[PDB]
Design a protein around this motif. Structure first.
Motif, PDB file in Angstrom:
ATOM      1  N   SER A   1       0.343  -1.408  -0.085  1.00 57.33           N
ATOM      2  CA  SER A   1       0.308   0.255   0.028  1.00 57.33           C
ATOM      3  C   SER A   1       1.322   0.924   0.333  1.00 57.33           C
ATOM      4  O   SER A   1       0.580   2.586  -1.002  1.00 57.33           O
ATOM      5  CB  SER A   1      -0.619   0.316   1.208  1.00 57.33           C
ATOM      6  N   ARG A   2       1.980   1.076   0.947  1.00 59.80           N
ATOM      7  CA  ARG A   2       2.622   2.132   0.642  1.00 59.80           C
ATOM      8  C   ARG A   2       4.097   2.136   0.022  1.00 59.80           C
ATOM      9  O   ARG A   2       4.024   3.189  -0.103  1.00 59.80           O
ATOM     10  CB  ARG A   2       3.636   2.656   2.045  1.00 59.80           C
ATOM     11  N   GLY A   3       3.474   1.072  -1.426  1.00 61.56           N
ATOM     12  CA  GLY A   3       4.443   1.341  -1.945  1.00 61.56           C
ATOM     13  C   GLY A   3       6.584   0.669  -1.772  1.00 61.56           C
ATOM     14  O   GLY A   3       7.642   0.715  -2.390  1.00 61.56           O
ATOM     15  N   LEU A   4       6.480   0.167  -0.545  1.00 66.07           N
ATOM     16  CA  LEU A   4       7.842   0.143  -0.017  1.00 66.07           C
ATOM     17  C   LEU A   4       8.397  -1.437  -0.092  1.00 66.07           C
ATOM     18  O   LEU A   4      10.055  -1.173  -0.279  1.00 66.07           O
ATOM     19  CB  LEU A   4       8.136   0.227   1.564  1.00 66.07           C
ATOM     20  N   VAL A   5       7.324  -2.075  -1.146  1.00 66.78           N
ATOM     21  CA  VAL A   5       7.658  -3.474  -1.924  1.00 66.78           C
ATOM     22  C   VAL A   5       7.280  -3.840  -2.806  1.00 66.78           C
ATOM     23  O   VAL A   5       6.939  -2.805  -3.287  1.00 66.78           O
ATOM     24  CB  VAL A   5       7.353  -3.996  -0.795  1.00 66.78           C
ATOM     25  N   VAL A  18      -8.103  -6.646  -6.975  1.00 72.46           N
ATOM     26  CA  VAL A  18      -7.646  -5.550  -5.756  1.00 72.46           C
ATOM     27  C   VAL A  18      -8.362  -3.793  -5.850  1.00 72.46           C
ATOM     28  O   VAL A  18      -8.121  -3.691  -7.997  1.00 72.46           O
ATOM     29  CB  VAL A  18      -7.101  -5.305  -6.064  1.00 72.46           C
ATOM     30  N   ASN A  19      -8.515  -3.439  -5.778  1.00 75.94           N
ATOM     31  CA  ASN A  19      -8.197  -1.442  -5.648  1.00 75.94           C
ATOM     32  C   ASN A  19      -6.611  -1.903  -5.166  1.00 75.94           C
ATOM     33  O   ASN A  19      -5.928  -2.415  -5.567  1.00 75.94           O
ATOM     34  CB  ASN A  19      -8.697  -1.107  -4.704  1.00 75.94           C
ATOM     35  N   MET A  20      -5.791  -0.324  -5.024  1.00 71.88           N
ATOM     36  CA  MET A  20      -5.243   0.243  -5.597  1.00 71.88           C
ATOM     37  C   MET A  20      -4.179  -0.380  -6.715  1.00 71.88           C
ATOM     38  O   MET A  20      -3.149  -0.200  -6.116  1.00 71.88           O
ATOM     39  CB  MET A  20      -4.549   0.158  -4.361  1.00 71.88           C
TER      40      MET A  20
END
Length: 54
Positions: A1-5, A18-20
């Motif tokens: 969700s936070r884009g860290l992966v 999925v959303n996002m």
RNA sequence: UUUUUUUUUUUUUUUUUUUUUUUUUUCUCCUCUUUUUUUUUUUU
């Protein structure tokens, strides 16, 4: 969700809806395993997994 | 070359009370023999 992966490996527990959505989606195979007939994918499935990229 | 989904340990609590040991039967019932009754007295 936070884009860290960056790179995610997921089965159909996360694919078809999925959303996002991220920017790109890749397919490593053409077939799938349903309830013991070993069929291939159909447009009703390809639309949902690949229809969420933007 | 074998994916996806199928809930879990009933709810409740902040009600008054002015009595007192026991407890309830058993019927009438032939007493055998020297006597009047002896007696003061003194040593404790």
């Amino acid at each position: 969700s936070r884009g860290l992966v960056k790179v995610l490996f997921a089965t159909e527990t996360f694919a078809m809806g999925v959303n996002m959505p991220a920017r790109t989606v890749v397919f490593d195979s053409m077939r799938k395993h349903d309830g013991s007939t070993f069929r291939d994918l159909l447009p009703g499935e390809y639309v949902q997994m690949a229809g969420r990229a933007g």
